[PDB]
Amino acid sequence: VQSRGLDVAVRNANDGISIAQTAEGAMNETTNILQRMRDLSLQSANGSNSKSER
Amino acid sequence: VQSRGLDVAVRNANDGISIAQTAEGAMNETTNILQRMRDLSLQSANGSNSKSER
Numbered sequence: 001v002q003s004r005g006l007d008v009a010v011r012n013a014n015d016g017i018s019i020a021q022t023a024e025g026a027m028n029e030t031t032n033i034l035q036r037m038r039d040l041s042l043q044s045a046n047g048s049n050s051k052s053e054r
Numbered sequence: 055v056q057s058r059g060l061d062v063a064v065r066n067a068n069d070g071i072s073i074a075q076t077a078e079g080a081m082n083e084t085t086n087i088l089q090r091m092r093d094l095s096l097q098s099a100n101g102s103n104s105k106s107e108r
Contacts, residue, residue, distance in 0.1 A: 004093055007093075012097065012100035012102070015100055016102065019102055
């Protein structure tokens with residue numbers, strides 16, 4: 001019983017890794033988008049840009 | 055009388071071991087079925103599973 005249990009337990013833990021790894025991957029794109037948004041924001045602050053550019 | 059009786063007694067005990075042996079064999083499948091139920095249950099507990107899976 002203990003062994004057969006550890007086997008299903010291993011699979012269950014593997015699913016744990018899958019859910020988390022899927023999320024980390026998505027949050028990678030999230031981080032990238034935010035960084036780009038930051039760049040555009042600093043570009044906007046420059047007094048040179050006119051209202052149309054902002 | 056004693057000898058003839060002991061023969062009948064031996065037959066009785068053999069048939070007694072028969073009833074017991076049959077029973078033990080059946081309860082063996084019981085243990086196997088219960089063990090699989092445990093595996094399925096621990097598999098359900100894993101948070102990854104969704105209502106459909108459970």
